[PDB]
Design a protein around this motif. Structure first.
Motif, PDB file in Angstrom:
ATOM      1  N   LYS C   2       0.874  -1.065  -0.132  1.00 34.04           N
ATOM      2  CA  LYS C   2       0.058  -0.040   0.127  1.00 34.04           C
ATOM      3  C   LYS C   2       0.701   1.354   0.185  1.00 34.04           C
ATOM      4  O   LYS C   2       1.584   1.409   1.013  1.00 34.04           O
ATOM      5  N   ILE C   3       0.575   1.908  -0.920  1.00 35.76           N
ATOM      6  CA  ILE C   3       1.342   3.319  -1.103  1.00 35.76           C
ATOM      7  C   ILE C   3       0.336   4.604  -0.902  1.00 35.76           C
ATOM      8  O   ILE C   3      -0.767   4.595  -1.440  1.00 35.76           O
ATOM      9  N   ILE C  32     -11.414  11.687  -9.097  1.00 31.59           N
ATOM     10  CA  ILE C  32     -10.054  11.265  -8.712  1.00 31.59           C
ATOM     11  C   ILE C  32      -9.661   9.922  -9.006  1.00 31.59           C
ATOM     12  O   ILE C  32      -8.568   9.765  -9.696  1.00 31.59           O
ATOM     13  N   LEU C  36      -6.719   8.936 -11.577  1.00 36.70           N
ATOM     14  CA  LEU C  36      -5.405   7.894 -11.294  1.00 36.70           C
ATOM     15  C   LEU C  36      -5.531   6.551 -11.909  1.00 36.70           C
ATOM     16  O   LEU C  36      -4.439   5.938 -11.885  1.00 36.70           O
ATOM     17  N   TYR C  40      -2.343   4.841 -13.751  1.00 43.28           N
ATOM     18  CA  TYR C  40      -1.644   3.864 -12.775  1.00 43.28           C
ATOM     19  C   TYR C  40      -1.903   2.549 -13.481  1.00 43.28           C
ATOM     20  O   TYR C  40      -1.497   1.453 -12.849  1.00 43.28           O
ATOM     21  N   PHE C  46      -0.031  -3.333 -10.479  1.00 45.05           N
ATOM     22  CA  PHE C  46      -1.120  -2.305 -10.239  1.00 45.05           C
ATOM     23  C   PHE C  46      -2.504  -3.124  -9.756  1.00 45.05           C
ATOM     24  O   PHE C  46      -2.793  -4.034 -10.541  1.00 45.05           O
ATOM     25  N   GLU C  47      -3.309  -2.802  -8.589  1.00 44.25           N
ATOM     26  CA  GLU C  47      -4.258  -3.481  -8.290  1.00 44.25           C
ATOM     27  C   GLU C  47      -5.518  -2.713  -8.383  1.00 44.25           C
ATOM     28  O   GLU C  47      -6.478  -2.702  -9.016  1.00 44.25           O
ATOM     29  N   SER C  48      -5.561  -1.723  -7.309  1.00 42.32           N
ATOM     30  CA  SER C  48      -6.670  -0.592  -7.202  1.00 42.32           C
ATOM     31  C   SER C  48      -6.044   0.733  -6.483  1.00 42.32           C
ATOM     32  O   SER C  48      -4.926   0.623  -5.963  1.00 42.32           O
ATOM     33  N   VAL C  49      -6.630   1.762  -6.863  1.00 42.84           N
ATOM     34  CA  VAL C  49      -6.532   3.048  -6.296  1.00 42.84           C
ATOM     35  C   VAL C  49      -7.740   3.475  -5.674  1.00 42.84           C
ATOM     36  O   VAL C  49      -8.786   3.439  -6.189  1.00 42.84           O
ATOM     37  N   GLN C  50      -7.689   4.023  -4.292  1.00 42.09           N
ATOM     38  CA  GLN C  50      -8.931   4.564  -3.828  1.00 42.09           C
ATOM     39  C   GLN C  50      -8.596   5.734  -2.914  1.00 42.09           C
ATOM     40  O   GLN C  50      -7.809   5.802  -2.326  1.00 42.09           O
ATOM     41  N   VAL C  51      -9.521   6.796  -3.238  1.00 42.26           N
ATOM     42  CA  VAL C  51      -9.520   8.044  -2.172  1.00 42.26           C
ATOM     43  C   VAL C  51     -10.050   7.344  -0.998  1.00 42.26           C
ATOM     44  O   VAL C  51     -11.369   7.151  -0.670  1.00 42.26           O
ATOM     45  N   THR C  52      -9.458   7.804   0.138  1.00 41.58           N
ATOM     46  CA  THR C  52      -9.865   7.411   1.696  1.00 41.58           C
ATOM     47  C   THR C  52     -10.296   8.737   2.406  1.00 41.58           C
ATOM     48  O   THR C  52     -10.827   8.660   3.550  1.00 41.58           O
TER      49      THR C  52
END
Ligand SMILES: *[C@@H]1O[C@H](CO)[C@@H](O[C@@H]2O[C@H](CO)[C@@H](O[C@H]3O[C@H](CO[C@H]4O[C@H](CO)[C@@H](O)[C@H](O[C@H]5O[C@H](CO)[C@@H](O)[C@H](O)[C@@H]5O)[C@@H]4O)[C@@H](O)[C@H](O[C@H]4O[C@H](CO)[C@@H](O)[C@H](O)[C@@H]4O)[C@@H]3O)[C@H](O)[C@H]2NC(C)=O)[C@H](O)[C@H]1NC(C)=O
Ligand SMILES: *[C@@H]1O[C@H](CO)[C@@H](O)[C@H](O)[C@H]1NC(C)=O
Ligand SMILES: *[C@@H]1O[C@H](CO)[C@@H](O)[C@H](O)[C@H]1NC(C)=O
Ligand SMILES: *[C@@H]1O[C@H](CO)[C@@H](O)[C@H](O)[C@H]1NC(C)=O
Ligand SMILES: *[C@@H]1O[C@H](CO)[C@@H](O)[C@H](O)[C@H]1NC(C)=O
Ligand SMILES: *[C@@H]1O[C@H](CO)[C@@H](O)[C@H](O)[C@H]1NC(C)=O
Ligand SMILES: *[C@@H]1O[C@H](CO)[C@@H](O)[C@H](O)[C@H]1NC(C)=O
Ligand SMILES: *[C@@H]1O[C@H](CO)[C@@H](O)[C@H](O)[C@H]1NC(C)=O
Lengths: 13, 360, 57
Positions: C2-3, C32, C36, C40, C46-52
């Motif tokens: 996780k980044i 967003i 992204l 990416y 790469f698997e997933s990007v999520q705004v948290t």
């Protein structure tokens, strides 16, 4: 007034 | 403006996934700038969330987030990401009813009556009893309101009834809960005198309970309060005051005792001898950080109006073990620190420490 | 793996950004995450990007 006690841990040497 | 915090989950390593994102960071930044106006230099990607928490979120070192309060409370919560999590620096969350009650008082300080203050303290007692969450904003307010009442009742020579002194004790017991020390620690970071002000307010209010409303005993869970009238009996036995508090972390009760010999009452007897004690006060009265000492006994108070006592014996139980060098101290309101001027150690038993002070 | 990543959007913050169920949160999070994801997706692993989270910083 308002009273209590203060205590410190044992320090060697 | 709007700080957007996200996360990227991948199957590679932390160094490889990072390096891959930085090398397309300007292509992601140009895609986001086609949907929203971005600040220059704001795009920062990092693979280590030093502080991560549901309440606040994730952030890097020295990052500081200020969020609003919740329902019923008004103010803001501020916290900065340190090496040990999100340390809350400023929490101003005050209950609406508490703040609403605080605002009716500003219209009463002018024309205030002894019956008006008693109903105000009562309205205060119910609000804290119904909503017992001692948040830092509440702690700062209750200490403030009680001090505005104490200073008003002193500057007006009002008399605290016996039902009003019970409400003050109930308020004290609620904010002196052992689960409030952490929030008390946050309050002292800003108002380093709030704990001392509470103790001074309790002591000042206790002097206003007349001899007609005594004897009176309010033994709660976190604060004991005993007040008696004086008769020719004190010329004979002296003054004795004992407490037995059983905290949850010790199977042994933490005892305390004040002994005033019958010789100290030789002068004209005063009017009332008010005594009180508490254990949480020991954890919220700040001690010098340069010293490794700590309050290892119940904070014991005793007030006598217009009377100087030259010898008082005090017996304190030790709460914690493996501690040595007992130091008899009293809380100095003027310098806002523990002080040992006038108090000397008599004898230390395996269980209790005996002190003798030249002032009360 | 996780980044984390953050950026500042030059607009006015709203307490609805603190409610993930709000349409204002859903508009920005989707906006967003879509851009992204398009940037990416060609990254290996790469698997997933999520705004948290959304802050007033
Ligand atoms: C020391 O201070 C801390 C804060 O600095 C005190 O924590 C505060 O406790 C308050 C108790 O009332 C609470 O007020 C509100 O709580 C309920 C709503 O809060 C939820 O949503 C919040 C998001 O806005 C969230 O912060 C909160 O808890 C989160 O944080 C904890 C850890 O702190 C996590 O473990 C949780 O999982 C969660 O993520 C809640 O999730 C709400 O029910 C309360 O109702 C009030 O109003 C009612 C009428 O509207 C009334 O009936 C009732 O009596 C209440 O007065 C209220 O809105 C604060 O939100 C909370 N602070 C924070 C930052 O969460 C802590 O209690 C104090 N220590 C003490 C008292 O010993
Ligand atoms: C502080 O709280 C108020 C409401 O009590 C809210 O309008 C404001 O946005 C909050 N400030 C921050 C920085 O979150
Ligand atoms: C008095 O305070 C209560 C809440 O404590 C609230 O109704 C308002 O601030 C005041 N009520 C009056 C003056 O009618
Ligand atoms: C609260 O308001 C005043 C004092 O603040 C008092 O006279 C009144 O009776 C109280 N009423 C309620 C409902 O608490
Ligand atoms: C009450 O008194 C204290 C100082 O004694 C002060 O901090 C506060 O502003 C006063 N008034 C109110 C409404 O709290
Ligand atoms: C208050 O009640 C107590 C009984 O608990 C009594 O000793 C005291 O005299 C009362 N004070 C008055 C007169 O209000
Ligand atoms: C034990 O509980 C008391 C509460 O009376 C507290 O003052 C003390 O710090 C506690 N000590 C430990 C080691 O938990
Ligand atoms: C977010 O807004 C919706 C509005 O439909 C509301 O139902 C929900 O309770 C809000 N979230 C929180 C945490 O209160």
């Amino acid at each position: 007034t308002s009273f209590s006690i203060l205590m410190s841990p044992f320090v060697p040497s | 403006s709007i700080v957007a915090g996200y996360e990227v989950v991948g199957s590679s390593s932390a160094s490889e996934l990072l390096s891959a994102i930085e090398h397309v960071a300007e292509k992601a930044k140009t895609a986001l700038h086609k949907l929203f106006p971005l600040e220059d230099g704001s795009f920062r990607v990092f693979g280590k969330a030093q502080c991560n928490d549901i309440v606040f979120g994730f952030g890097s070192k020295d990052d500081e987030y200020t969020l609003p309060c919740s329902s019923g409370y008004r103010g803001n919560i501020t916290a900065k990401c340190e090496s040990s999590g999100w340390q809350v620096i400023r929490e101003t969350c005050v209950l609406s009813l508490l703040e609403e009650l605080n605002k009716n008082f500003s219209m009463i300080v002018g024309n205030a009556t002894e019956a008006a203050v008693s109903s105000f303290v009562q309205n205060l007692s119910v609000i804290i009893r119904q909503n017992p969450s001692t948040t830092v904003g509440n702690l700062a307010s209750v200490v403030s309101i009680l001090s505005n009442i104490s200073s008003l009742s002193l500057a007006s020579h009002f008399r605290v009834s016996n039902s009003t002194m019970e409400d003050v004790i109930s308020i004290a017991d609620n904010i002196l809960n052992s689960a409030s020390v952490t929030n008390w620690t946050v309050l002292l970071r800003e108002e380093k005198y709030a704990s001392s002000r509470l103790l001074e307010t309790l002591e000042n209010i206790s002097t206003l309970v007349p001899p007609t409303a005594l004897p009176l005993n309010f033994s709660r869970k976190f604060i004991d309060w005993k007040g008696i009238p004086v008769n020719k009996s004190q010329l004979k036995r002296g003054y004795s005051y004992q407490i037995k508090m059983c905290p949850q972390n010790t199977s042994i009760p933490i005892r305390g005792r004040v002994l005033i010999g019958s010789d100290q009452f030789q002068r004209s007897l005063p009017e009332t001898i008010i005594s009180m004690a508490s254990l949480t006060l020991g954890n919220i009265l700040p001690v010098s950080k340069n010293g490794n000492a700590q309050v290892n006994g119940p904070v014991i108070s005793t007030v006598i109006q217009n009377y100087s006592i030259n010898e008082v014996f005090l017996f304190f139980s030790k709460i914690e073990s493996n501690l040595s060098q007992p130091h008899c101290v009293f809380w100095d309101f003027s310098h806002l620190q523990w002080n040992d001027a006038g108090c000397h150690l008599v004898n230390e038993t395996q269980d209790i420490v005996t002190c003798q002070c030249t002032h009360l | 793996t996780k980044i984390w990543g953050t950026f500042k959007i030059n607009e006015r913050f709203t307490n609805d950004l603190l409610n993930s169920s709000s349409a204002i949160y859903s508009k920005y999070a989707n906006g967003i995450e879509i851009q992204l994801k398009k940037a990416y997706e060609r990254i290996q692993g790469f698997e997933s990007v999520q705004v948290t989270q959304f802050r007033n910083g």
